[PDB]
Amino acid sequence: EIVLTQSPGTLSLSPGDRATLSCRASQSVRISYLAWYQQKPGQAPRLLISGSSSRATGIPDRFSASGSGTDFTLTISRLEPEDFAVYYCQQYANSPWTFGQGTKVEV
């Protein structure tokens, strides 16, 4: 029903710089029903930001989400050596929920 295309495919910045990721939809747009997960290699994904304003418990103040319409953006202040993993966008509002494609961040 809905599709969430992600970009850019790969990002590689030095540890200490700010990074950004974008994911966009095509059909009707809802704002406060988007969440960003990350999947470490071999382990189940965990929640990072949901609702664009409320973070998960224990997550530091580093991550920040935004976006109003079709586009949605996630920003990371700095890349600590453990912050290298895949990222996924998910939405709940519309017809049967779908996940993103998956983007990887490198060093």
Partner 1 sequence: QMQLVQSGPEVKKPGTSVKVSCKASGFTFTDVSSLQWVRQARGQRLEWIGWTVVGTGNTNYAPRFQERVTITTDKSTSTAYMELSSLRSEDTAVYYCAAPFCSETSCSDGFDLWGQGTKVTVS
Partner 2 sequence: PNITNLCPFDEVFNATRFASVYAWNRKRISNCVADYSVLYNLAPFFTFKCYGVSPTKLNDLCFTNVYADSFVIRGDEVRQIAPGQTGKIADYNYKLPDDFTGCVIAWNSNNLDSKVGGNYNYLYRLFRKSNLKPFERDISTEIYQAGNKPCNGVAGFNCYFPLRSYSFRPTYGVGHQPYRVVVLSFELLHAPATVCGPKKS
Q: Which does 93 bind (CB under 5 to 8 A by kind): partner 1, partner 2, none?
A: partner 2
Mark residues 57-86: x for contact with partner 1 by CB under 8 A, - for none: x-----------------------------
Pick the binder of partner 2 from 78, 93, 102, 107 (CB under 8 A). 93
Burial tier of 27 (Cβ tally within 10 Å: 0-12, 13-18, 19+): exposed
Pick the binder of partner 2 from 92, 99, 102, 107 (CB under 8 A). 92
A 10 A CB-CB count for 83 gives 15
Amino acid identity for residue 44 in this structure: A
Residue list 36-55, contact with partner 2 (CB under 8 A) = 51, 54
Which chain residues interact with partner 1 by CB under 8 A? Answer: 32-33, 35, 44-47, 50-51, 54, 56-57, 88, 90, 96-102
Which chain residues interact with partner 2 by CB under 8 A? Answer: 32-33, 51, 54, 92-93
